[PDB]
Design a protein around this ligand. Structure first.
Ligand SMILES: [Mg+2]
Ligand SMILES: [Mg+2]
Ligand SMILES: [Mg+2]
Ligand SMILES: [Mg+2]
Ligand SMILES: [Mg+2]
Ligand SMILES: [Mg+2]
Ligand SMILES: [Mg+2]
Ligand SMILES: [Mg+2]
Ligand SMILES: [Mg+2]
Ligand SMILES: [Mg+2]
Ligand SMILES: [Mg+2]
Ligand SMILES: [Mg+2]
Ligand SMILES: [Mg+2]
Ligand SMILES: [Mg+2]
Ligand SMILES: [Mg+2]
Ligand SMILES: [Mg+2]
Ligand SMILES: [Mg+2]
Ligand SMILES: [Mg+2]
Ligand SMILES: [Mg+2]
Ligand SMILES: [Mg+2]
Ligand SMILES: [Mg+2]
Ligand SMILES: [Mg+2]
Ligand SMILES: [Mg+2]
Ligand SMILES: [Mg+2]
Ligand SMILES: [Mg+2]
Ligand SMILES: [Mg+2]
Ligand SMILES: [Mg+2]
Ligand SMILES: [Mg+2]
Ligand SMILES: [Mg+2]
Ligand SMILES: [Mg+2]
Ligand SMILES: [Mg+2]
Ligand SMILES: [Mg+2]
Ligand SMILES: [Mg+2]
Ligand SMILES: [Mg+2]
Ligand SMILES: [Mg+2]
Ligand SMILES: [Mg+2]
Ligand SMILES: [Mg+2]
Ligand SMILES: [Mg+2]
Ligand SMILES: [Mg+2]
Ligand SMILES: [Mg+2]
Ligand SMILES: [Mg+2]
Ligand SMILES: [Mg+2]
Ligand SMILES: [Mg+2]
Ligand SMILES: [Mg+2]
Ligand SMILES: [Mg+2]
Ligand SMILES: [Mg+2]
Ligand SMILES: [Mg+2]
Ligand SMILES: [Mg+2]
Ligand SMILES: [Mg+2]
Ligand SMILES: [Mg+2]
Ligand SMILES: [Mg+2]
Ligand SMILES: [Mg+2]
Ligand SMILES: [Mg+2]
Ligand SMILES: [Mg+2]
Ligand SMILES: [Mg+2]
Ligand SMILES: [Mg+2]
Ligand SMILES: [Mg+2]
Ligand SMILES: [Mg+2]
Ligand SMILES: [Mg+2]
Ligand SMILES: [Mg+2]
Ligand SMILES: [Mg+2]
Ligand SMILES: [Mg+2]
Ligand SMILES: [Mg+2]
Ligand SMILES: [Mg+2]
Ligand SMILES: [Mg+2]
Ligand SMILES: [Mg+2]
Ligand SMILES: [Mg+2]
Ligand SMILES: [Mg+2]
Ligand SMILES: [Mg+2]
Ligand SMILES: [Mg+2]
Ligand SMILES: [Mg+2]
Ligand SMILES: [Mg+2]
Ligand SMILES: [Mg+2]
Ligand SMILES: [Mg+2]
Ligand SMILES: [Mg+2]
Ligand SMILES: [Mg+2]
Ligand SMILES: [Mg+2]
Ligand SMILES: [Mg+2]
Ligand SMILES: [Mg+2]
Ligand SMILES: [Mg+2]
Ligand SMILES: [Mg+2]
Ligand SMILES: [Mg+2]
Ligand SMILES: [Mg+2]
Ligand SMILES: [Mg+2]
Ligand SMILES: [Mg+2]
Ligand SMILES: [Mg+2]
Ligand SMILES: [Mg+2]
Ligand SMILES: [Mg+2]
Ligand SMILES: [Mg+2]
Lengths: 38, 174, 208, 141
RNA sequence: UGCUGAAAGCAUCUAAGCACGAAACUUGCCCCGAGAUGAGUUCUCCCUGACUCCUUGAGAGUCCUGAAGGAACGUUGAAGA
RNA sequence: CGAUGUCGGCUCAUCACAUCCUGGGGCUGAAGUAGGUCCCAAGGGUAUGGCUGUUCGCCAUUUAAAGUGGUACGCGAGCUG
RNA sequence: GUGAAGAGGGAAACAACCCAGACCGCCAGCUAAGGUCCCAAAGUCAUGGUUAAGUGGGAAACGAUGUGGGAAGGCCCAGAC
C-alpha cells in the first residue's frame, strides 16, 4: 500500500474506511489502489 | 435502524433466556451465551425477538442493529449449525483429521498440527479438502482463517489454502 | 536445587578416542540442611544448608545455637537455595553429590579472583594510545571521558579504573564429566571462578 | 492580636478509610491531597502537618475516563547514560497498583520536608484487607 | 492480516464483542541491591541488681555488675593503594 | 577581545532516526532466485589497506553491513601538532 | 507607549507584553489585569448547547459516508433509493 497524504478513490471498486483513526482506501479489483493515511 | 426494526423469529426447541443484558440461547446443536452491550435493550415480544435503542445513550441504533444481526446468526447457528468448505490447491499438499487436530501438510519441513478450540466438528470428504462444521460463526470463521493463514493463495497457480466460494486473481509471468 | 563445594584445582580427563577434556575438581561434601524456609513464615520456599566443619570455639553462640535448632554440626559458612515447588526437604537432612548424577550441564557460581585496583586497559579492554610518535605522559590513560558544555558532565556507568575481580560471577552451562560418589567430587568441563580453596555454588543449568 | 497557629504537639490526628473502587483517579487524589495536607480542618496552618491519616484500599480497581487506561504514560529516568523508562497505565496497575495513587497524590501535595511528611500519612493498598485495624479508621467518602 | 458486525436491508477488520502479529517494549538469563528513612521477613543468641534525687520526668543520679558480642593487638592470605 | 585554544588524527564515547546489515509486514511491470519502492522497527552490529595534513574523495581487497547526522563542525587542565 | 531612569500583581521562569505609578506604618475593607479541583488565595457554582481528538496543550497546501447546527434542492401509496 501507499501512505500518501491525500488518499483518493481511484477506480470504481475503491472504498473509504476509517480504521483505528487512520483513513484507509481498500479496493477489490486492483490491490495497487490500496492506500493509507490522509 | 432498518435491521433493528425487523424482529428475529425463534423456532421451537430453542430456549432463549435474558439475564439482564447477558443473553443465553440453548438449542439442539449447542448452548451459546452472549454478553450484550449496555446501550442495547432487548425483550421478548410474542414469538419473535425485539431490539430497542436505549434513550440517553448516543449511538443506540448502531448498537442494537448489531445485536439483532448477532442473535439472528446465533439462532440460525443453534438451529442449523454453520459449515465452511476449505480446499487445498497444489501438488504435495495434504489434509487429514485425527480427533480434534487437523494435520496440514503444506509443503513445509514439518507437518502442521492445527488445534480446534471449542465445539468445532472437522471433516474431510477428500484428502485435499477440509469441510468443518459447528455452532458459532465466529469460531468457525477464525479457525477457517487460521487454516487459510497457514498458506494464503499464491496469485500465479492459486496454490495454498482457499475458501470454496472465494475467487482468486492470478497473473502472468513478466 | 544446587550444592556448595570447595574448588580443588583443575585436571584433564583423557577420553579413550583421544580428546583431553579439561576438568575442574570440585569437592562436594555432605551438604546438610540447617533450615527449611516456607510460605507460611517466610513468604517463599527455600532451604538453608551448611558444609565443612568449624572448630569448637571460632563459631559464636548466635551461630552455634542456629545449628542446635536443626541438630547438625557447625559447618563453615551458610548458604540458601530456592526450592522449585515440587521438591520438599526436612531439617537436618544430608544432601550428597548424587543429585548431580542425573544432570548433564551445571551453572557454577563463585567469587572471581581479586585483581585489585585495575586500570582501564586491563579492566575494560581499552586500547593504549601510541607508545611513541610524540606521546607525552598518556600511554595507558583513558583519554576523553565526555563531550563538552552539552552534558556538562560525565555520564553514569562510564568505564573507568577501579576494583577488578573479587566479585560473585556465574559461568553458565558447564558440562559435567564425572560424579565421584565415593570421594565426593564433581568433575565439570572447563574452568570455574575463584582460586583453589574458594567456595563454589554449583547448580543445574537454568538455560536448558 | 497575633493569630493562632497549630502546635505540632497539640495536633490530634484522625484516621480514615477510603474505598477507591470505581473512583476517578484525579478527583480521588485531589480530595485525598486536600485532607492529607489538613485543609478541611478549621485550625489549618501551612507550616504544620495538621492533616489526617488516610487508608486508600482497593487502589488497583481505580477508574479512569477516556482512553487513559492505555494512553496515559508514566515516564521516569533511571539516573543513567540514556535510561528513560516509560510505562502505560495498564502496565502500571499490572505490576505496581499502589504507585498509581501514590504518584497522583504526591504531585498534588507540596514539595519539601512537610510535603514528604504529609505523604507518609497516606496508606494505599491493592487488596480490600488492611492491617491498620488497631486505630479504628472510620469510613470516609 | 483476519473473524463476526452495525451505524448505512447490503457492504465493510470495529462502532459492542473475539483473534493473530517483530532483534523494539515487560519478563525470562547474569550482577548489585531494605540509607527501599516506605530502613521488610525468618532464624538463633544475650542482659531478669541495688539505692537515693528533685522543677514525679523517656529527669538526673549513685554500689555494684560488663553479657552476647565487637574492636584492638599478633601470625597472616590465591583479599588488598 | 582585563583570551570561549579554531582543521585533521588517536583514546574515549554518547544520543537522534531521516535504517546500511540483521527482525516483521503491503504493493509489485512479485513464476523461483534476486530485486524495486513503501511501512513499522534504534535491540545489537557496522572494514583493513594505498595516496594525500587532510575531512572528503578515488583506488585494491574484504563484509551480513562498511548508515546519515547531533554532541563548542563531541573530546588539546586526555595525547599528537 | 513602556524600559532606560519604576518597584508592585499577572503572562510558569520573562528590562520593553497586560494591569498599575512605592512618603511611612497597621495581623483592616472594595476592586484592576488575571483568576477560582490540588501544588496555591478564591465557584467539583446555575442555565442551554458543542467536543470523543487528551483536541484544549505548536503548523500549510491538500485529503476523507468524523460530527453538530441550519437554508434549500431530487421521488412515492401509479410503492423510488
Ligand atoms: Mg508516512
Ligand atoms: Mg479497539
Ligand atoms: Mg505476497
Ligand atoms: Mg575466647
Ligand atoms: Mg573472628
Ligand atoms: Mg562471612
Ligand atoms: Mg587477590
Ligand atoms: Mg587486555
Ligand atoms: Mg581476560
Ligand atoms: Mg592503538
Ligand atoms: Mg612532544
Ligand atoms: Mg602532559
Ligand atoms: Mg614518554
Ligand atoms: Mg613535553
Ligand atoms: Mg596530561
Ligand atoms: Mg602533568
Ligand atoms: Mg539541550
Ligand atoms: Mg545542568
Ligand atoms: Mg552449545
Ligand atoms: Mg539501552
Ligand atoms: Mg512552591
Ligand atoms: Mg515527622
Ligand atoms: Mg452486514
Ligand atoms: Mg539473535
Ligand atoms: Mg524477544
Ligand atoms: Mg533468530
Ligand atoms: Mg528471577
Ligand atoms: Mg537474581
Ligand atoms: Mg546473585
Ligand atoms: Mg560491576
Ligand atoms: Mg559489585
Ligand atoms: Mg548496602
Ligand atoms: Mg535495616
Ligand atoms: Mg512493611
Ligand atoms: Mg532499678
Ligand atoms: Mg522516672
Ligand atoms: Mg540517667
Ligand atoms: Mg564502676
Ligand atoms: Mg569496662
Ligand atoms: Mg554475666
Ligand atoms: Mg570473646
Ligand atoms: Mg568476652
Ligand atoms: Mg557489639
Ligand atoms: Mg603481615
Ligand atoms: Mg575573566
Ligand atoms: Mg579531532
Ligand atoms: Mg584511521
Ligand atoms: Mg577512534
Ligand atoms: Mg522509521
Ligand atoms: Mg528517507
Ligand atoms: Mg511476507
Ligand atoms: Mg542502541
Ligand atoms: Mg529504546
Ligand atoms: Mg527484549
Ligand atoms: Mg591506518
Ligand atoms: Mg609504502
Ligand atoms: Mg605537508
Ligand atoms: Mg566526519
Ligand atoms: Mg561529513
Ligand atoms: Mg572544505
Ligand atoms: Mg563517507
Ligand atoms: Mg577512506
Ligand atoms: Mg570497491
Ligand atoms: Mg572489490
Ligand atoms: Mg565483494
Ligand atoms: Mg557479499
Ligand atoms: Mg548491498
Ligand atoms: Mg554545526
Ligand atoms: Mg571539535
Ligand atoms: Mg579538539
Ligand atoms: Mg577540554
Ligand atoms: Mg606543523
Ligand atoms: Mg516592572
Ligand atoms: Mg512582573
Ligand atoms: Mg512574577
Ligand atoms: Mg496564561
Ligand atoms: Mg492573557
Ligand atoms: Mg511564558
Ligand atoms: Mg500557565
Ligand atoms: Mg511566580
Ligand atoms: Mg516578556
Ligand atoms: Mg506616588
Ligand atoms: Mg472583594
Ligand atoms: Mg475580572
Ligand atoms: Mg500567585
Ligand atoms: Mg483553594
Ligand atoms: Mg485555544
Ligand atoms: Mg478537501
Ligand atoms: Mg465529513
Amino acid at each position: 500500500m501507499k501512505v500518501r497524504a491525500s488518499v483518493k478513490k481511484l477506480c470504481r471498486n475503491c472504498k473509504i474506511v476509517k480504521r483505528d483513526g487512520v483513513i484507509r482506501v481498500i479496493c477489490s479489483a486492483e490491490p495497487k489502489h490500496k492506500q493509507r493515511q490522509g | 435502524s432498518r435491521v433493528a426494526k425487523a424482529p428475529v423469529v425463534v423456532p421451537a426447541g430453542v430456549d432463549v433466556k435474558i439475564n439482564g443484558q447477558v443473553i443465553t440461547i440453548k438449542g439442539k446443536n449447542g448452548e451459546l451465551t452472549r454478553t450484550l452491550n449496555d446501550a442495547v435493550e432487548v425483550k421478548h415480544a410474542d414469538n419473535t425477538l425485539t431490539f430497542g435503542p436505549r434513550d440517553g445513550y448516543a449511538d443506540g441504533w448502531a448498537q442494537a442493529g448489531t445485536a439483532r444481526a448477532l442473535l439472528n446468526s446465533m439462532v440460525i447457528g443453534v438451529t442449523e449449525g454453520f459449515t465452511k468448505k476449505l480446499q487445498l490447491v497444489g501438488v504435495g499438499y495434504r489434509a487429514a483429521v485425527k480427533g480434534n487436530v487437523i494435520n496440514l501438510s503444506l509443503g513445509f519441513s514439518h507437518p502442521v498440527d492445527h488445534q480446534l478450540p471449542a465445539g468445532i466438528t472437522a471433516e474431510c470428504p477428500t484428502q485435499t479438502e477440509i469441510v468443518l462444521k459447528g455452532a458459532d460463526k465466529q469460531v468457525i470463521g477464525q479457525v477457517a482463517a487460521d487454516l487459510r493463514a497457514y498458506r494464503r493463495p499464491e496469485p500465479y497457480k492459486g496454490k495454498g489454502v482457499r475458501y470454496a466460494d472465494e475467487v482468486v486473481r492470478t497473473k502472468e509471468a513478466k | 536445587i544446587g550444592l556448595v563445594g570447595k574448588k580443588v584445582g583443575m585436571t584433564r580427563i583423557f577420553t579413550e578416542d583421544g580428546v583431553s577434556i579439561p576438568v575442574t575438581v570440585i569437592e562436594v561434601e555432605a551438604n546438610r540442611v540447617t533450615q527449611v524456609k516456607d510460605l507460611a513464615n517466610d513468604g517463599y520456599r527455600a532451604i538453608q544448608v551448611t558444609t565443612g566443619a568449624k572448630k569448637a570455639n571460632r563459631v559464636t553462640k548466635p551461630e552455634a545455637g542456629h545449628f542446635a535448632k536443626a541438630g547438625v554440626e557447625a559447618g563453615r559458612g551458610l548458604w540458601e537455595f530456592r526450592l522449585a515447588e515440587g521438591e520438599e526437604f526436612t531439617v537436618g537432612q544430608s544432601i550428597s553429590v548424587e543429585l548431580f548424577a542425573d544432570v548433564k550441564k551445571v551453572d557454577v557460581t563463585g567469587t572471581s579472583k581479586g585483581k585489585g585496583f585495575a586500570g582501564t586497559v586491563k579492566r575494560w579492554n581499552f586500547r593504549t594510545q601510541d607508545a611513541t610518535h610524540g606521546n607525552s605522559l598518556s600511554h595507558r590513560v583513558p583519554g576523553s571521558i565526555g563531550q563538552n558544555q552539552t552534558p556538562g558532565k560525565v555520564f553514569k556507568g562510564k568505564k573507568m579504573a577501579g576494583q577488578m575481580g573479587n566479585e560473585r560471577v556465574t559461568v553458565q552451562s558447564l558440562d559435567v564429566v564425572r560424579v565421584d560418589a565415593e570421594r565426593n567430587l564433581l568433575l565439570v568441563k572447563g574452568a570455574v571462578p575463584g582460586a583453589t580453596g574458594s567456595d563454589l555454588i554449583v547448580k543445574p543449568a537454568v538455560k536448558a | 492580636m497575633k493569630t493562632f497557629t497549630a502546635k505540632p504537639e497539640t495536633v490530634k490526628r484522625d484516621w480514615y478509610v477510603v474505598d477507591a473502587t470505581g473512583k476517578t483517579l484525579g478527583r480521588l487524589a485531589t480530595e485525598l491531597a486536600r485532607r492529607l495536607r489538613g485543609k478541611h480542618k478549621a485550625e489549618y496552618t501551612p507550616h504544620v502537618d495538621t492533616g489526617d491519616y488516610i487508608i486508600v484500599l482497593n487502589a488497583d480497581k481505580v477508574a479512569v475516563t477516556g482512553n487513559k487506561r492505555t494512553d496515559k504514560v508514566y515516564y521516569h529516568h533511571t539516573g543513567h547514560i540514556g535510561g528513560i523508562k516509560q510505562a502505560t497505565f495498564e502496565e502500571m496497575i499490572a505490576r505496581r497498583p499502589e504507585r498509581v495513587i501514590e504518584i497522583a497524590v504526591k504531585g498534588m501535595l507540596p514539595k519539601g520536608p512537610l510535603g514528604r511528611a504529609m505523604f507518609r500519612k497516606l496508606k494505599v493498598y491493592a487488596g480490600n484487607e488492611h492491617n491498620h485495624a488497631a486505630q479504628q479508621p472510620q469510613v470516609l467518602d
